[PDB]
RNA sequence: ACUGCAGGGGAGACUGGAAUUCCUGGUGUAGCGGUGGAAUGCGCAGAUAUCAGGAGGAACACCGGUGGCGAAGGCGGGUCUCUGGGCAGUAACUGACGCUGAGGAGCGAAAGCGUGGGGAGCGAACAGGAUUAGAUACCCUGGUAGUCCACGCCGUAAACGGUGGGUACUAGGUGUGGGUUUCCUUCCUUGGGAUCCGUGCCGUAGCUAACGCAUUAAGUACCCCGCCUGGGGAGUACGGCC
């Protein structure tokens, strides 16, 4: 079940990218 | 009033349909009765029964304009590829020369995405 | 067992369309090594010869 | 590129004794000739990266050789540098 | 070929200029220059018939040979490549071997000092002027005339070209840089090649004053006019124009080509 | 100064007698800059395997020059731009 | 260095044919298309089909392989031009000039970004149809970016052999790719053997948690570098560089 180790990383990276896309503007570009 | 004794039967048997056209040797269609022309609709036009009625209809309509002697150019990866030509044989045409003209792309146009069904 | 390995100083040129008649199917397809019995370099040479013959119309691109 | 009769005319002028072809100086000479012609090849064909990497390989080789000669003897280093061109 | 000024000033921030690297002899040939005065967009009536013209740098007209009819067989040498304020293309000063001085539109690849032939026997090189009969199908051409002997009128701005599409009986079909397919008579002559200076469309004029130098005068939007001046005028705040967009004269947007113009027979397919 | 083998496919409309001078007027420019010609063999009329340039026949010519790359490129240019040729194929016989 | 050798190694220009799409015309009539089944859709204003011509773009069937080349990423229609590396043999030459390599620099699939072209087909987004409890999907019909080109930027991939580079040694058996060399040598057989460099499979010793690796090591050793120190938090925050 080595793919599980990839899925956890995938979900964490996906949520981080989703947060960055939620804030690619003065929400975060100012900061 | 157009009378020609010799002709060519172009047969296109695609996974959904079959289309049989009778042309002169020069390549001018006279009769084209196809699988939708014979009463069918939807997935039933893919069947060999529809193939061997469409070919029969095309054959009789072409005989009405006066063709005894046809030569067949078949194309397409469909199941109505032999039922059709025996239908032309048994509907009064003489089969003559049989060929294969399915286009073979030398890796040209990019094909559509594979169905994920 | 390769013909050109056996027979020397026979350069493979598209001009020798008479020799290039074989190694080509009746459809016009280039035959494979397992059917021509010939080596990799000579198969390269005959393939190049066949293609140049095709582009100078000495050999058909499509045929029956 | 660099046919036999083209390499001989700097083998006599840069190699030591009528048959020297592997000395430091000789190697610098024909590497420099190769780099010159390949830099012409790269002034045309700006984006031939696989040959430009070969150029950098020759450049590295020549750099090792020039440091070799500068360690082994410095007067010959000076002479070769003046009569080829450095910096 | 385009050199960008540095943002040393707000008027030059994004501005660019041609490097003029193709030009030799920054002066024109004296015998070949005729005077030219601005009109301000005014016709013979003294009235503005083309808006937005006026001011602009004083200019001199060089005579370009859009005919190239009378020196078939006599060769020319490109003496110089030179600026011309009157067109976006550069011009080529040709010395004919008979001693005649000529200006032509400068194609791509006619560096100074190379040979230009004219007539039916000319080689198919950039700058050679031949009849469309002798020009083979598929090649890029420019300065092509609409009528035999009427002078070049087609594809003569910088970077423009027709490609000859075909020649069936007595008409050459050709694709005009608008994308339009048109037939002209095969005895219409064209010069082989793209027009040079193809990169001048990328020039970013930095400031209003530079277009004022090139002679364009400020354009006022109809929507900030009053109703008496423009159909889009009026409104309390800013509006979109209270109607479908029309010209200052009330003409709706739409095709303005004469639907029954005589050249429809030669126009094969209108632009896309 | 390199070997080149050139096959040219000419229109079948012209005759078998005027072909040689029509090619001499092309090869002389090859001759003017030091390049020479070994064999200008003409196979004549011959049926060609697929329709080319609205002609089903073609004159075969094998040129066999020994010339600089610039000169052979110029020759291929000229005879491809002429109206009397349907095909050109340039090769090198040497390694 | 010299003599040979193989190759889709790279770049530039020109160029070939199949096929798809579209246009023009000829024929010809009521369907076509598509699906698990349909519908949206296309057509009856002449579609699909078929013939001829033409425009254009992209990819290069058969060769083609388990193969070859490239440091890796990657690389094949053909021709020409320029160009890189590799392998073998002679022993002509230099005489340890080598290995690795913190930093650094360059190259670096695809997607993406900038500018300008191009745009056939495909096809994120989007829209409709269908399915469904819903269907922001899978399937269908269209279809924009993109995919292509030029030039820059990006610098990331399960960028994998999940195996850093160099070197030496340690049963074999069997393929395949590129050379060299000895015996029936003219019995042609283009067989047999040796050797160098690849590239695969199977297997001994040895190693391994096992799976397996096994002369192309994951064996036996040496040199240098990169990296790890339980899982999450997290390759994230903060700072900084790009
Ligand atoms: Mg398990
Ligand atoms: Mg070979
Ligand atoms: Mg008055
Ligand atoms: Mg205006
Ligand atoms: Mg106001
Ligand atoms: Mg007023
Ligand atoms: Mg009004
Ligand atoms: Mg207002
Ligand atoms: Mg308001
Ligand atoms: Mg290559
Ligand atoms: Mg076609
Ligand atoms: Mg279109
Ligand atoms: Mg039609
Ligand atoms: Mg059609
Ligand atoms: Mg010594
Ligand atoms: Mg590092
Ligand atoms: Mg890079
Ligand atoms: Mg990309
Ligand atoms: Mg882009
Ligand atoms: Mg975007
Ligand atoms: Mg764009
Ligand atoms: Mg879709
Ligand atoms: Mg939907
Ligand atoms: Mg390119
Ligand atoms: Mg990574
Ligand atoms: Mg990979
Ligand atoms: Mg890793
Ligand atoms: Mg190791
Ligand atoms: Mg091995
Ligand atoms: Mg094993
Ligand atoms: Mg282990
Ligand atoms: Mg922890
Ligand atoms: Mg980060
Ligand atoms: Mg930060
Ligand atoms: Zn062989």
E54 and E215 Cβ atoms separated by less than 8 Å: yes
Compute CA distances E198 → B59, E18, E22, E124, E159, whole Å. Answer: 61, 11, 12, 20, 4
- Rg over alpha carbons for chain F, rounded to the nearest Å, is 13
Instruction: Establish how many alpha carbons lie within 13 A of residue C20's alpha carbon, considering only the half-sphere containing its beta carbon.
Output: 24
Q: Which chains touch A (3 or more CB pairs under 8 A)?
A: none
SS3 E101: strand
Instruction: Establish how many alpha carbons lie within 13 A of residue E96's alpha carbon, considering only the half-sphere containing its beta carbon.
Output: 17
SS3 D45: coil
User: CA angle, C14 as apex, C12 and C19 as ends, to 5°?
Assistant: 65
Integer distance in angstroms from CA E156 to C1' G4?
58
Distance between CA atoms of E186 and E165, rounded to whole angstroms? 12
Q: Which chain D residues in 19-38 sit with Cβ < 7 A of strand G?
A: 19-24, 26, 30, 34, 37-38
Q: Which residues, 6+ apart, have CB-to-CB distance to E204 below 8 Å?
A: E4, E14, E15, E16
Task: Tell me the pairing of strands F36-37 and E144-145.
Answer: unpaired
Q: Dihedral through CA D31, CA D37, CA D43, CA D46, nearest 10?
A: -70
How remote is the CA of residue E45 from the centroid of ligand 3, in Å?
6
Tokens 């060519």, located at residue: B8
Distance between CA atoms of D83 and D81, rounded to whole angstroms? 6
Resolution given for this structure, in angstroms: 2.3
- C15 and F49: CB-CB below 8 Å? no
SS3 A23: coil
Experimental method: cryo-EM
- The residues after which chain F has a C–N gap greater than 2.5 Å are none
E184-219 exposure pattern, b = at least 16 Cβ within 10 A, e = fewer: bbbebbbbbbbbbbbebeebebbeeebbbeebbeee
Tokens 């000169």, located at residue: F71
Nucleotide closest in space to C34 (CA vs C1'): G65
First CA to last CA across chain B, in angstroms?
Answer: 51
């Amino acid at each position: 079940g080595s793919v599980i180790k990839k899925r956890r990383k995938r979900m964490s990276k996906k949520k981080h990218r989703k947060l960055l896309r939620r804030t690619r503007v003065q929400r975060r570009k100012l900061g | 009033k157009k009378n020609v004794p010799h002709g060519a039967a172009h047969i296109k048997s695609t996974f959904n349909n079959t289309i049989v056209t009778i042309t002169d040797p020069q390549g001018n269609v006279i009769a084209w009765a196809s699988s939708g022309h014979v009463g069918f609709k939807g997935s039933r036009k893919s069947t060999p029964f529809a193939a061997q009625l469409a070919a029969e209809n095309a054959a009789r309509k072409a005989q009405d304009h006066g063709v005894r002697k046809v030569d067949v150019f078949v194309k397409g990866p469909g199941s109505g590829r032999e039922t059709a030509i025996r239908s032309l044989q048994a509907a009064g045409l003489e089969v003559g020369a049989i060929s294969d003209v399915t286009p073979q792309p030398h890796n040209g146009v990019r094909p559509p995405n594979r169905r994920r069904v | 067992k390769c013909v050109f390995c056996a027979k020397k100083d026979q350069a493979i040129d598209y001009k020798d369309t008479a020799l290039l008649r074989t190694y080509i199917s009746e459809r016009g397809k280039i035959r494979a090594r397992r059917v021509t019995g010939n080596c990799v370099q000579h198969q390269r040479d005959i393939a190049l010869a066949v293609k140049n013959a095709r582009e100078v119309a000495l050999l058909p691109f499509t045929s029956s | 590129a660099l046919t036999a009769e083209q390499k001989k005319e700097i083998l006599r002028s840069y190699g030591l004794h009528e048959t020297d072809t592997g000395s430091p100086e000789a190697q610098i000479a024909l590497l420099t000739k190769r780099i010159a012609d390949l830099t012409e090849h790269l002034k045309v064909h700006k984006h031939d990266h696989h040959s430009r990497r070969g150029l950098l390989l020759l450049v590295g080789r020549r750099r090792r050789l020039i440091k070799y000669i500068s360690q082994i003897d410095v007067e010959r280093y000076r002479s070769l540098i003046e009569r080829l061109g450095l910096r | 070929a385009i050199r960008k000024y540095k943002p040393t000033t707000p008027g030059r921030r994004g501005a660019s200029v041609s490097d003029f690297a193709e030009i030799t002899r920054s002066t024109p040939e004296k015998s070949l220059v005729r005077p030219l005065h601005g009109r301000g967009g005014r016709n013979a009536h003294g009235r503005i018939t083309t808006r937005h013209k006026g001011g602009g740098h004083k200019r001199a007209y060089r005579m370009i040979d859009f005919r190239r009819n009378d020196k078939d067989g006599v060769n020319a040498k490109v003496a110089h490549i030179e600026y011309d304020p009157n067109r976006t293309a550069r011009i080529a000063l040709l010395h004919y071997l008979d001693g005649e001085k000529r200006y032509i539109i400068a194609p791509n690849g006619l560096s100074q000092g190379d040979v230009v032939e004219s007539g039916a026997n000319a080689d198919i090189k950039p700058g050679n002027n031949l009849p469309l009969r002798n020009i083979p199908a598929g090649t890029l051409i420019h300065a092509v005339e609409l009528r035999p002997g009427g002078g070049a009128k087609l594809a003569r701005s910088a970077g423009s070209s027709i490609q000859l599409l075909g020649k069936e009986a007595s008409y050459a079909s050709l694709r005009m840089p608008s994308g339009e397919i048109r037939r002209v008579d095969v005895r219409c002559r064209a010069t082989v090649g793209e027009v040079g200076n193809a990169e001048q469309a990328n020039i970013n004029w930095g400031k209003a004053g530079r277009m004022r130098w090139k002679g364009k005068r400020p354009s006022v939007r109809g929507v900030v006019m009053n109703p008496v001046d423009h159909p889009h005028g009026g409104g309390e705040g800013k509006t979109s124009g209270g109607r479908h967009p029309v010209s200052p004269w009330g003409k709706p947007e739409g095709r303005t080509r004469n639907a029954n113009k005589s050249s429809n027979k030669f126009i094969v397919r209108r632009r896309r | 100064m390199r070997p080149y083998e050139i096959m040219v496919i000419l229109d079948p409309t012209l005759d078998e007698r005027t072909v040689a001078p029509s090619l001499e007027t092309f090869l002389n420019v090859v001759r003017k800059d030091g390049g020479k010609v070994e064999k200008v063999d003409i196979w004549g009329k011959r049926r060609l395997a697929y329709e080319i340039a609205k002609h089903a026949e073609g004159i075969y010519v094998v040129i066999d020059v020994k010339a600089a790359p610039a000169t052979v490129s110029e020759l291929d240019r000229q005879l491809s731009l002429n109206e009397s040729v349907l095909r050109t194929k340039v090769m090198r016989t040497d390694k």
